[PDB]
Design a protein around this ligand. Sequence first.
Ligand SMILES: [Zn+2]
Lengths: 596, 172
Amino acid sequence: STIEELAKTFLEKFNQEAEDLSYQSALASWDYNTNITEENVQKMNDAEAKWSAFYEEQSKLAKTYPSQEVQNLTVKRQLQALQQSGSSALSADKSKQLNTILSTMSTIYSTGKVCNQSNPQECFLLEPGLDEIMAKSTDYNERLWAWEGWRSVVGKQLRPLYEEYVVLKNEMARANNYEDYGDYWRADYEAEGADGYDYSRSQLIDDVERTFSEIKPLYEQLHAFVRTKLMDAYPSRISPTGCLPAHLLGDMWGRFWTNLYSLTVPFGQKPNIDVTDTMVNQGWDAERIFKEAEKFFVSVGLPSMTQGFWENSMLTEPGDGRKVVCHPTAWDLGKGDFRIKMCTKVTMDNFLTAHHEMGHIQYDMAYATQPFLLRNGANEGFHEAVGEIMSLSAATPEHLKSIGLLPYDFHEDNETEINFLLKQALTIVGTLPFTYMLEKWRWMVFKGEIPKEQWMQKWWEMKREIVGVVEPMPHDETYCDPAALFHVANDYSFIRYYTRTIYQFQFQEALCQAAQHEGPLHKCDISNSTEAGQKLLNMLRLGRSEPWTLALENVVGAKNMDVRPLLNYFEPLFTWLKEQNRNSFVGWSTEWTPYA
Amino acid sequence: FNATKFPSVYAWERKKISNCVADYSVLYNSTFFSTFKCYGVSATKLNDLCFSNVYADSFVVKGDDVRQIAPGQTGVIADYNYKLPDDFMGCVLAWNTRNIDATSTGNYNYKYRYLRHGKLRPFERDISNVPFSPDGKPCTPPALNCYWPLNDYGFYTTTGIGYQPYRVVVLS
Ligand SMILES: [Zn+2]
């Protein structure tokens, strides 16, 4: 008969059963996470296995219904989202091979050991010691040996598995009538709709590069100031005009430069606002912190939190001795249940993180009315971009003075603003070229353009071409450099960070422009202003029911990514940098390396 | 008066009350009632309107579905489980039962229907469990393209605010 009724009935059945299986799995996972034992893992694994089995058996069963004949965009979008499942279309033995390869890869990454600098008994692993030694040490040799040893272990322990895994993934993708695995990854941004609202995945490469050439001048203006401010730290080790060595960025790989503030400060004679004080004296707690966050959010015009959030969610370290990780997170378990799991403290970072997580929970409640298969973000960047503008707005001195944590006669000093802007730029700007490089290299690998024996060398070339980072030691083809990263050993996408970084500042510029704020954008607080909240909520509710271009157009006014707000945000910082740099800022030339 | 056991939607309980006068005036200082609406009258004509030969319809639903028990309001279960008339209006009273009808391990004793051939007229009750086929051809389950018409709700204790078991009574 007619295809439409068949598709409608199948979608209704799928939603019916998913709405129960997902909730059971989420509840088991939460029960395990709140109380760690040797018995909750079995329940969690049972629920996860049941849900995965049902999803795999029902995903590639409606392929009998063609996707070309559907007339509504709703049903067509749901069917398109459901059809792409993965390895289930392949043979059982191939699926088992892929699963074994993935398990071996994750296991070999998780249990890394590095043991040098003394008699070899002390094993630091990664999480206990390497993060701290990277984030606190000011010695060259320690960081260099840690970097080289960790890579020489993990890359040579992981490379053959990836070598076979890329081939098998490409074959599996070809089984689904795609052309490569990278196309499957970038297919998330494929969208169809009206005459001018459509977006082809092949256009993605065109967009991402086009914006980057507009960020190049500001980034370099940062890249100079850091370099010329490391002469004070390391006397004759980093080149006057050369690329920054990889292991001096304050992190293991170089994702963030946030730990270099102590070495590079504009004015050390003046402190920052409320840095870990006045809350001990005023006598606050977690409940008051969350109450103030809720007050700030209702002052804009967005709905307040439900009672179940206060009743079920834990907001402090348990007093019964139960072991938890309690890494702060916001859980949406389905059936209208939203929770926040976070161990509280009386620092400022907790104060801002409460607002950030409350913004994700606001996004969580935004699109709860959409059907099950579309309850997600517009793409992989919107969800993270929504929650950071709240942290941006909360840290302004106007709100801190309004609350009462600051004296009313404390003026906005000249040095404090530029200090705040520099600290923010030390984190936001520096993460874009790295993400762009990683995604481009992985896409090129999956494309098959680069042969099998020329992988690693080509990778390092991009390091000198986009981000301006030079390898500290030579690397042959045996290594697998990206395999050391967590997001690559357990395969995940990466361009979502780039998209999030652009979208968050687009959103903030639009909202503040709607807030009738005169002056710089760094003093923006949307408090006592409902227009920004109304405009943002006008977009939050869509979910994934419309192509992401229309979702972006509803607040910013444009249909693609624009980078003008990001440059406008750092305008005083830009002028200050151009004034201070009477030298450098003349780019980098890719011939200087530490070893030659 | 009240019972500890409540039926489902497509097996809604019907009670006929006659030769009785009730007030239920306690609703002034009654925060226990989640929602209370009246469509036919606004209590203005209560002085000159005595109650006789009334019907009480009782079932258990979800919060998001309480708005569906009203004239119009197409929804999903308002056309397949319980259809409201356009003229005969009484009152609707729905209250929360999270603390008694919800268990932390699960409660799957309430079912509902979401597949049917043809619309539902007012006061129409469907019980038979016949396999649903979108193109005729009486099926032999579990054959392909031959679905089941029933589902279970699954109210738990730690759900949200609209995904909780609400007991609903309609007085006609
Ligand atoms: Zn987040």
